[PDB]
Design a protein around this ligand. Structure first.
Ligand SMILES: [Mg+2]
Ligand SMILES: [Mg+2]
Ligand SMILES: [Mg+2]
Length: 217
């Protein structure tokens, strides 16, 4: 079918955080049925970023979730047309990030277009001071919502000196399927582990790896 055991992805991300304009490109691959993927990301405009790359990392891939056959896979069913996602992220101490994403399939490659707008991060907070240490593993609750899905995640951004910055994601996943059917899942959870590795000194190059597995709520 269209989502093969090996799939490539490409991403273009444009946005701003606290007025700082940037652009990133990414490419990678994974095993959509095993829920594993890796991607290589470059900051191509606005680099070096004067904020933590961690606030972008969660915007770089829902086709690579391991769904058990008993839980319908909204994302893989949405091809060939694909799906969109819209997110609002609220950070402890201020920091609101709004994200709009398109997922398409072009010549057998997944193609992502992402728009990111971050505002009101404190000037001497760990995001704008680049004192973050990556994301804890998290569980995203998935709910049926008017023929799409609502995702809800409480994430913990690790900070220098042992603390965390609490943050909350509400995501709306919408199908772009204009011909054909989608079997809607019930309430479920997705367990995520997002790792950054192979980073350059000023985060102009970052490798992300993700493990995403669906389970019953
Ligand atoms: Mg399915
Ligand atoms: Mg902060
Ligand atoms: Mg660098």
């Amino acid at each position: 079918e269209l989502i093969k055991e090996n799939m490539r992805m490409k991403v273009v991300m444009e946005g701003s955080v606290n007025g700082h304009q940037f652009k990133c490109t990414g490419e990678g691959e994974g095993n959509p049925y095993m829920g594993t993927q890796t991607m290589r990301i470059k900051v191509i405009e606005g680099g070096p970023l004067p904020f933590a790359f961690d606030i972008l990392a969660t915007s770089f891939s829902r086709t690579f979730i391991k769904y058990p056959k008993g839980i319908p896979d909204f994302f893989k069913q949405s091809f060939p047309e694909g799906f969109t996602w819209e997110r609002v992220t609220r950070y402890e101490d201020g920091g609101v990030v709004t994200v709009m994403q398109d997922t398409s399939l072009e010549d057998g490659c997944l193609v992502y277009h992402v728009q990111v707008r971050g505002v009101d991060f404190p000037s001497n907070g760990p995001v704008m001071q680049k004192k973050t240490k990556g994301w804890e593993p998290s569980t995203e609750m998935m709910y049926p919502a008017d023929g799409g899905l609502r995702g809800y995640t409480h994430m913990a951004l690790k900070v220098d000196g042992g603390g965390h910055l609490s943050c909350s994601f509400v995501t709306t996943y919408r199908s772009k399927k204009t011909v054909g059917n989608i079997k809607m899942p019930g309430i479920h959870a997705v367990d995520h582990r997002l790792e950054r590795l192979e980073e350059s000194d000023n985060e102009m190059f970052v490798v992300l790896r993700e493990h995403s597995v669906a389970k019953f709520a």
